[PDB]
Design a binder for this molecule. Structure first.
Ligand SMILES: Cc1ncc(C[n+]2csc(CCOP(=O)(O)OP(=O)(O)O)c2C)c(N)n1
Ligand SMILES: Cc1ncc(C[n+]2csc(CCOP(=O)(O)OP(=O)(O)O)c2C)c(N)n1
Ligand code: SF4
Ligand code: SF4
Ligand SMILES: [Mg+2]
Ligand SMILES: [Mg+2]
Lengths: 572, 291, 572, 291
């Protein structure tokens, strides 16, 4: 039984394409439904074709889905951009008559629903209310709660006066009436309303900023870069409320430099960037490793290489995150799946930087950055918070004291009797420069054993599927995890012998857990969106698995059917 | 607001020396600057638990190792950017950056404008020897064109820059210059730089006898000219005239000092206008995301 | 039969430790001998313990050797620094009487030869001539040709006047007389002179600079960093003679930017740096890959991570060289073994950047940088030169034209009818920004297939040893190749079933050639000086070899006996 | 000596338009600067086969797409350093950098001093809109503190910098300012910058109506003040006084112009003193390494 509905709305940005999608998402959440959205702004700032896709369901949602069930075109350009996906079985709502285009032969089997959105909006002497007419029609045709939709519109337009709101509700009613006059022949309906859940709706980048704040963030420095700037925007607004400071630095080098200085001063500090910025930070992340100074970098991955494809989907910064430092210079690397992770794994990221006095990189991506989801409302008291090991004041303080757990107690400036230097030169226990062979061997083992002990403490590699032997195991990372989750639902509903594993700690990697998983699968497929198969590379280098890479690199995420089809090709 | 000053009784310069032997070349001008730092710290009665010395890479940049305080030895050119993060995180600390002409104005030249423009409450002591000492004698942005050095065996193909004029143009609110041969001039100007609330920059000529054979002690002694007592240290235009060296003479003394909000003060104003504090109910932020 | 002699000279830098070694090296080369040297400058610029080690032989030399046969201490500190290596059987020359130390119990079996170097120089009223006295004694005691030694001294001091020269020759003769008065009990003598060969003596960094010039270098930009600055020093001196320009940029980002700008203008361009600088260059090397702009970076590797150990030995930048770019951003990576390679492989590096319009990184190291060798005199006409493919002027010019060999003809600005854009954005054939899925997939394949086709053209992975199946195979890279070469001489002389392989193309890697080698070995050992075993990582990731890593990371190179002992542990 | 000038007869501004449609917002000030660029190139009779436009990232930085010439679209903040290499490699080319206030003085701010100090023979057209346009509205080093933007919702916690004063202090040998609303003013100052032998800098106010709501056309029209004709463009001190805006008014016109050796000229002097040439016998260099 189909529990979800995927509605794509597209047209001229500025006619309310995005705002319409956000209204539907909020209305469905207020009606007790789960929501997953995605959008593309116009390619140029001045405007042009925009797209919003909202998926709503009575059950949990983990990705955008294969393709839309319903498409709503505000103009001809939107129809042309999506014509190839208007296939038999889909429902097609479009601005007609009185729009700017005559639709070609609507394919047989397509449920077509012309709605005169532009003409109705013009007869009311308010062309900008066109999206309200569309919303009314979509609500009527596909059972988007009229009650919560008008609640959402009331919250937005009530502050503008009783006339403005009653006008937009009137345009909504006109669209509802236009749709009611058509005969509904398609099988698509949004799930019936339920009791509203204790949820919020958040975008990926906002959720990263909130996770930092909830993790005890005190200092943030960043430089704007697509698709990461909304993290700094959120932090700039809300961190000062909690007693913290955001600074916009002059570039990414200055930003990570300020993070290290604030961290040395004793404050939990982080930055956010994308691929180009992470590459500029490579030298300073070496200093963080060598001096054992906590820091957190969130890399919202975008299309590369070089300037690349800033607005497209790609997870191709794994090589740089792990191997981007000169010398033997390891980082702790995490990667998020969904909006929930953007909160809790940014908390994880700060906690692990504190606990292991090391640079941590959290890999997100540009689709998740702008996707919104219903997620359970975060409760601040439910997050475990870890603070850097601090000196108890007993004995003599040595910044790099050799301990059993390889973690040297820290001391913020101002601590009596703990004056010390943090340094990027190789050094002995007191931080004095030391170039002797035995010390370099000894301190490499200290810092490597320290960071590698994350494996004994942080486990985040969920396994699902059949319990026994599997014909195919699937390993993936990043937001591709969510796509494989939906594919696994379909594969196990077909009775296929499949299992899946979802590493979210990417480096150091839990080799034994990899080997235990692979030993139970006849074959292991690794789907990821990068050209070289970057996770597969590390699986080959570090485990006894030789995976079958399934790589794509066209600026788009995987869809569930692609995973399903690839898996079935490997089952005999 | 720095809380390190006038906290200790009967402090002497040697109380701020670390155990690390100072291994600069004999006759290196950096010794005179280091002695000035010790003297400034003792005259201020500084509690060096609340003192942070931060440097990049260079002979000059070794200075924090020789100071008994909190300190960081960071990356070439990045000390001032690191120190900004330290200072903003902990405005109670006395934050001092030390470094050379290459560390500061070559690789570090991109961070210099923004520290000064933002008036970060810190002190920058630049030890200007007209060369890259630590990498063994390449020319610097302050080298004279007639000098030959190891990547310029046929002379430097450009003119040097003017550090004082840069920093005045950038908006430094305390700008001074001295010669390492006058350790009491160094001490007074560095002490005033530490006490100043805002970005304070002290350019100090320092001989490198090992590699710089023309910017000698005698050259610097003849180059400098004390600033007349009637000079108005609040007059930015007049300070810039001095920095441009009338008669070819480099001014020594205090060129410019003005009172303006610091970066940590403006950041604090933002929090105060929001009623921000560490105990803020984070549920209020979360509630903004409800559908 | 012992063909070589290893003489270590050590003491206060500034008393002529380095110049003394260079004099010995030049004299032995003039006498038809092969020479391999190494040195360490004083740890601080003001001075202190310096060391020079010269190895001379009637046969080819490939590394510094296990340890010295003869040690000459100018002061007590030098004796203490080397006390543990002054073992029975070795010869020991020391400053006595009149030195600054009382020697400890010289172990029985050590052939000790006191020479009053300091006092003799003082009697002549010229303490700075102390090293001349030492040279006379060493020449007499150990058969360093007096004839060629005085030639070398005459070439150096003849320009200062016949009095200055005759003074230094007298100090030499005084040292010769002091040593003749002792009875020689040790078996060590430098090989007797041979026909002098048509050779030069060159340090590694100078050889890189010469290799660049011989490869047609036209533009060099660098920023000083240890241990790479001597490259820029050599280029600055000699490149203007050939019509080229060196510029010192304000930092490494500016330097690689200027290299790319000059290369875009049509000039063969390069820089040199070390680990910290290569990390700063990561973003701009992405631009070189994406825009298909030739550039060459020589990374003279030093101790890392971070500031690390600038003066020590390490080959730990392989991870950064291969994986340092964001996105899928490959580089062509080579690594040199010896001074000969520093010349020819810098030519190779410039040639490959021209042919494949791609960033090339050549990995050297800080020991090779200052080591000198006798090498056959280079003749400019013996180097093959490759130039970038240029447009034939027919049709319409498209900067990124899709060709069968994936290499698009280039055109320098000023070329009629070839106005175009070079760009870091993903792009189509004309360089216009293009974010479509099919184009990204297509252009990834263009640039990757292009750079991977180096494997069909450049082969530099010598194999030596037994022809049949081997009990142990050795794979190594960098200057460690030279150490393993000598180890192979010893192992194959004992009739042991060993073979060795010396990759000098590091990326992309010739997997089939790796697999064919491994199929003929029961075991494969990979010695390298880094903590993680970086080459072993790529062997595991890309080949079927399961290597045994032999990693050291103490700032020192391997010695041949270390390789010999490890190999024997793996056979029996 | 640039060989692009006066090679074409009877050229019109439209002859330098490329086929690429202009994608800037309606009312964006960058249009007026683009028009000035077209007019300058036509008035110089430029053969754009010998013209190299280099830009980084930003709305401003997209301008070379609309100009018919050779071009490279490189990395954010690196266009001027890249252009230095192009210019030094090929001094016959006319090399022009275009970019915005963030590209030039934020991430690119460390390269700016050395281009000007070394007097590289290039033109830098900086399109100053007081904001980061392309990344959708964060504040820049020229933003006024009262402006609110997407990373500064509570105002800017620092003062803006002075681009003209920076460039004069840095040693730029041609320094001018204009407003995009006067495209003929832009064309004349851009034309003079291209013909000038040395580093020529033109700061042009350009409105960003989409994100910058306070630095509007009306604000810029009221802000500017044409430079009086009796101003001595060889007087650096007077130029710096003008750059500091007497009466709060931004000067427009040519502030400063002086003739000094360029970087490529000094590099050529080095080669000339060595008798350097491409056919040089490399065996002479090799022979120096004989034992
Ligand atoms: C990224 C990087 N680039 C280059 C270097 C090499 N380096 C160390 S110190 C130095 C310059 C020293 O000159 P200066 O700052 O004037 O200090 P001084 O030794 O003269 O006192 C350089 C270029 C480095 N350590 N890191
Ligand atoms: C290394 C890096 N960091 C950040 C960015 C993001 N970025 C692109 S343009 C830009 C600033 C645009 O401002 P400006 O230079 O003033 O030009 P404008 O759009 O205002 O004309 C930024 C921060 C980037 N492309 N690369
Ligand atoms: S090299 Fe120069 S700057 Fe460095 S310690 Fe010696 S004299 Fe001082
Ligand atoms: S965002 Fe601003 S600068 Fe960019 S095109 Fe639009 S108006 Fe112009
Ligand atoms: Mg210096
Ligand atoms: Mg701008």
């Amino acid at each position: 039984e189909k529990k979800d509905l995927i509605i794509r709305v597209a047209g001229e940005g500025g006619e309310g394409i995005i705002s319409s999608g956000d209204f539907i998402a909020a209305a469905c959440a207020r009606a007790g439904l789960e929501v997953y959205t995605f959008k593309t702004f116009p390619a140029e700032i001045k405007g042009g074709y925009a797209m919003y896709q909202v998926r709503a369901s009575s059950e949990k949602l983990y990705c955008q889905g294969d393709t839309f069930d319903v498409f709503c075109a505000f103009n001809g350009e939107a129809y042309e951009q999506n014509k190839d996906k208007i296939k038999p079985g889909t429902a097609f709502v479009y601005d007609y008559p009185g729009g700017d285009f005559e639709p070609d032969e609507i394919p047989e089997g397509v449920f077509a629903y012309p709605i005169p959105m532009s003409q109705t909006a013009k007869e009311m002497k308010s062309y900008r209310s066109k999206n309200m007419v569309a919303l009314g029609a979509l609500s009527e045709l596909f059972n988007i709660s009229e009650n919560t939709l008008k609640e959402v519109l009331s919250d937005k337009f009530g502050k503008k006066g009783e006339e403005v709101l009653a006008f937009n509700l009137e345009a909504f009613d006109k669209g509802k009436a236009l749709a009611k006059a058509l005969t509904k022949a398609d099988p698509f309906r949004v799930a019936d309303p339920q009791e509203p859940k204790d949820v919020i709706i958040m975008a990926g980048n906002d959720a990263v900023g909130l996770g930092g704040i909830l993790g005890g963030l005190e200092f943030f420095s960043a430089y704007p870069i697509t698709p990461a700037t909304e993290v700094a925007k959120y932090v700039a607004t809300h961190l000062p409320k909690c007693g913290g400071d955001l600074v916009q630095a002059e570039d990414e080098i200055a930003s990570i430099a300020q993070v290290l200085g604030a961290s040395y001063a004793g404050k939990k500090s982080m930055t956010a960037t994308s691929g180009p910025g992470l590459a500029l930070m490579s030298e300073m992340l070496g200093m963080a490793h060598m001096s054992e100074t906590p820091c957190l970098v969130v890399d919202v991955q975008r299309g590369g290489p070089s300037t690349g494809l800033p607005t497209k989907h790609e997870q191709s910064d794994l090589f740089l995150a792990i191997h981007g430092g000169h010398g033997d210079s390891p980082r702790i690397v995490l990667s998020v799946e969904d909006v929930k992770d953007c909160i809790s794994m940014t908390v994880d990221g700060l906690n692990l930087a504190e606990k292991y006095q090391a640079p941590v990189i959290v890999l997100s991506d540009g689709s998740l950055a702008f996707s919104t989801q219903t997620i359970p409302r975060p409760k601040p008291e439910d997050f475990t918070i870890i603070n850097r090991k601090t000196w108890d004041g007993q004995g003599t303080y040595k910044r790099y004291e050799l301990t059993e757990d390889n973690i040297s107690p820290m001391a913020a400036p101002g601590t009596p009797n703990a004056k010390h230097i943090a340094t990027g030169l190789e050094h002995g226990e007191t931080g004095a420069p030391n170039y002797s062979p035995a010390n370099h061997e000894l301190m490499h083992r200290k810092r490597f054993n320290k960071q590698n002990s994350v494996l004994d403490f942080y486990k985040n590699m969920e396994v699902e599927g059949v319990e026994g032997e599997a014909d195919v195991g699937i390993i993936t990372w990043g937001s591709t995890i969510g796509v494989v989750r939906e594919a696994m639902q379909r594969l196990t509903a077909e009775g296929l012998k499949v299992k899946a594993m979802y590493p979210k700690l990417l480096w150091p990697m839990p080799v034994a857990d990899y080997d235990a998983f692979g030993a139970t699968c006849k074959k292991v497929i690794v789907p990821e969106v990068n050209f070289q198969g970057q996770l597969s590379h590390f699986i080959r280098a570090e485990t006894s698995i030789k995976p079958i890479p399934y790589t794509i690199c066209g600026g788009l995420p995987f869809t569930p059917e692609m995973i399903v089809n690839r898996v079935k090709e490997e089952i005999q | 607001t720095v809380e390190a000053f006038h906290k200790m009784e009967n402090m002497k310069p040697k109380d701020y020396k670390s155990e690390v032997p100072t291994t600069w070349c004999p006759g290196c001008g950096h010794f005179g600057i280091l002695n000035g730092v010790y003297r400034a710290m003792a005259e201020l009665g500084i509690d060096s638990t609340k003192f942070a010395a931060i440097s990049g890479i260079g002979c000059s940049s070794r200075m924090p190792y020789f100071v008994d305080s909190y300190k960081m030895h960071t990356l070439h050119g990045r000390a001032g950017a690191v120190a900004t993060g330290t200072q903003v995180a902990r405005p109670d600390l006395c934050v001092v950056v030390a470094g050379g002409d290459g560390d500061g104005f070559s690789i570090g030249g991109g961070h210099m404008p923004h520290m000064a423009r933002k008036n970060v409450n810190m002190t920058y002591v630049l030890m200007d020897n007209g060369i890259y000492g630590l990498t063994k004698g390449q020319y610097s942005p302050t080298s004279r064109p007639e000098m030959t050095a190891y990547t310029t065996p046929y002379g430097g193909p450009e003119n040097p820059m003017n550090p004082l004029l840069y920093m005045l143009t950038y908006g430094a609110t305390y700008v001074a210059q001295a010669f390492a041969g006058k350790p009491k001039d160094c001490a007074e100007l560095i002490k005033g730089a530490m006490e100043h609330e805002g970005f304070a920059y002290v350019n100090i000529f320092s001989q490198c006898p090992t590699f710089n054979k023309i910017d000698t002690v005698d050259f610097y002694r003849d180059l400098v000219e004390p600033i007349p007592e009637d000079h108005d240290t609040s007059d930015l235009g007049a300070a810039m005239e001095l920095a441009r060296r009338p008669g070819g003479k480099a001014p020594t003394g205090l060129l410019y000092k003005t009172s303006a909000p610091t970066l940590d003060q403006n950041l604090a104003k933002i929090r105060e206008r929001l009623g921000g504090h560490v105990g803020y109910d984070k549920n209020k932020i979360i509630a903004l995301a409800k559908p």
